[PDB]
Write a protein that binds this DNA or RNA. Structure first.
Length: 51
RNA sequence: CGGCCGCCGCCGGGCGCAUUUCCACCGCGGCGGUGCGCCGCGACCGGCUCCGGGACGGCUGGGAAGGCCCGGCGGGGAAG
């Protein structure tokens, strides 16, 4: 949940404990990002228009 | 500075493909922008310009017709 992200089991057949990650850090942050993933907002896609 | 805790770097360790990092290819999955050039389409919204159907209130509680007209008084145009 917080120490890990999702669920530690697996890996480390010998050695220590078995902890795995999911949805890790970004490996590359672009030098300038744009905001606000656009949205639905009431402008429905073509699948749902009225024939 | 002694001590407290955290962080970072270096080193030494167990260590194995479900740990990790790197790569090439499919998923062309979730998301961000975007096409090479020419186009088209649908729906929501704003702004107009029009078209077609309705239903209603008043008036002199509308005027005047339209319909079935019957028993009388007259008058006036012009009646096979």
């Amino acid at each position: 949940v917080l120490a890990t992200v999702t669920k530690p089991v697996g890996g480390d057949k010998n050695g220590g404990t078995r902890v795995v990650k999911l949805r890790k850090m970004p490996r590359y942050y672009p030098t300038e990002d744009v905001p606000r993933k656009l949205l639905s907002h009431g402008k429905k896609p073509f699948s749902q228009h009225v024939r």
